[PDB]
Symmetry: D2
Subunit: 164 residues, 4 copies
Amino acid sequence: FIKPGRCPKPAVQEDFDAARYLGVWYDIQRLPNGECATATYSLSPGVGFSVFNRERLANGTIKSVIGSAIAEDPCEPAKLQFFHENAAPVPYWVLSTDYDNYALVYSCINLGASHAAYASIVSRQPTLPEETIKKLQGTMSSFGVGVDTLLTTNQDAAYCSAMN
Amino acid sequence: IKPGRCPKPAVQEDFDAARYLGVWYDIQRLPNGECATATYSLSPGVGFSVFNRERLANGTIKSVIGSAIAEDPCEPAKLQFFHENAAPVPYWVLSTDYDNYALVYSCINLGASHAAYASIVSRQPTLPEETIKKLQGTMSSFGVGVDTLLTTNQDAAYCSAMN
Amino acid sequence: IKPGRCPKPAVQEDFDAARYLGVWYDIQRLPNGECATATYSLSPGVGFSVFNRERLANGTIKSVIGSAIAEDPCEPAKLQFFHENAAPVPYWVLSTDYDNYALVYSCINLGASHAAYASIVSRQPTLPEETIKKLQGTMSSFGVGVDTLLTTNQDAAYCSAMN
Amino acid sequence: FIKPGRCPKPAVQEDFDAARYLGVWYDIQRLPNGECATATYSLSPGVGFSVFNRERLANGTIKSVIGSAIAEDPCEPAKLQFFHENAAPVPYWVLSTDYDNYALVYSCINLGASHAAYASIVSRQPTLPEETIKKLQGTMSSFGVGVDTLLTTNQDAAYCSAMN
């Protein structure tokens, strides 16, 4: 996931409301880095929220990873840090969301003169209308993400049946 | 605030977060309420959730919730603490036996100076004087002045409001 | 040390490091020697080299060399300062006209508190009272108490040992 | 330069003497990430040292980049941070050096559950004896660097003539 240049710093969702963002989200499109991916965001007894990521492996098994998400600076609640089990902390930015349909999430780490980027369009449903996807690919283009490089997540009902 | 950079003392080897859960009482701390307790719990995510309580001078219970996460899992004794409306601070478990005492350390660099927090805690409202002496020994080894240590008031009657 | 987290004030737009080089005199600063000057020079690497001088109460000149680097080149006004035997500290040029004044800021988080340094500097040993007032205005906007500001002694005779 | 797992933390050169490390170094072998590469380390009026990297581009031109290197914690003088022009800071660790012949340098950045690594065997001469290279590849193996993945730098006198 490596491109030349430093991390861009795109705009994040204004007035981000973590409470409305909780619940289940489905991956629709992502940069290259399992299928049927969902994230579930929950109340945390501490600060931030707890994260449950699930995906189907090519062999039919469900991989799952638990994590925590915390906005370090509370004045920018849309810029989080994600802590996964046995992973180092990674940035997680909610660039744009309506809370009820779509979200666009971004994550970038500097590597000298290069950077590694993760980006993802997610939805409250296993699908998202083509018009919305287009809008969000527009946003991604504005800070240099190549639309060609985007993979479509397989969210087929039958293939993803093992996710209950 | 003392001159010099943060020391980097040794941390508890093979630190077991599961055994560290539950209630701890402050026995001694560096200057920075009384009757202080911390309660560490299971977190649905990674790390554990923290509930700190203390009695204010006016009799009210102040409480703050937080989260503690070991950023590098290969050093599970070096945590980051995230409190509500606070910036993240380091939290190192230097030494613990899980059932009696712990010694916790936290230090932040300020140029040529540093700010340090240190605390002896216990599973009971009191801790034997021998154990305290041992742990003050450990603190001395990396430059903490034993004179500067305050004793936490854990008197049963004074602390009755903590149920 | 004040309660609350570090503010993040605006920095000088289109900051030109080349024009900022040369000698600056401390006029006012928050509490943390007198006759203080900083001298900024070309660095063969990136950023610039720093030579701070001050007069100690006993008449001796203390001096410390350092390096200043903008980690993110897209924000050239937000530097890191590296002094000998010190940990790195932030250094923000909030406002400067390059030929008369500058206002510099530095803040480090300590949990629910923070430690702040702020300084009004000048190209001359003095600065007009009007300019000082303007810059104190800027400081007030992000919560610096104007009362707490110390005036640096830049008296020609007292500072004669600085050549 | 991306492998799974977190950054290893190998041992660094004990009692590292920055003064002896100054001068000219030639790249002999490196992980994938120009040829004829040299680094020149110099006195810095501030703290740390100044860096001048040079290499030959495939078209015959000399690319050069200036930088600064600083040990943030002076108690670990072998763990530096490198600041290049228009680059974000990267770690630079001197794992092993004799100051007069060879050095082995390492640099690794975490990317969640993965990491990106740079490693380099350098020499005071355009070549280094095969025995020494073997020793240093041994050290690299101990913390999981695949010896197969190592590229040999072209330091041919004639091809590198443009470097004066």
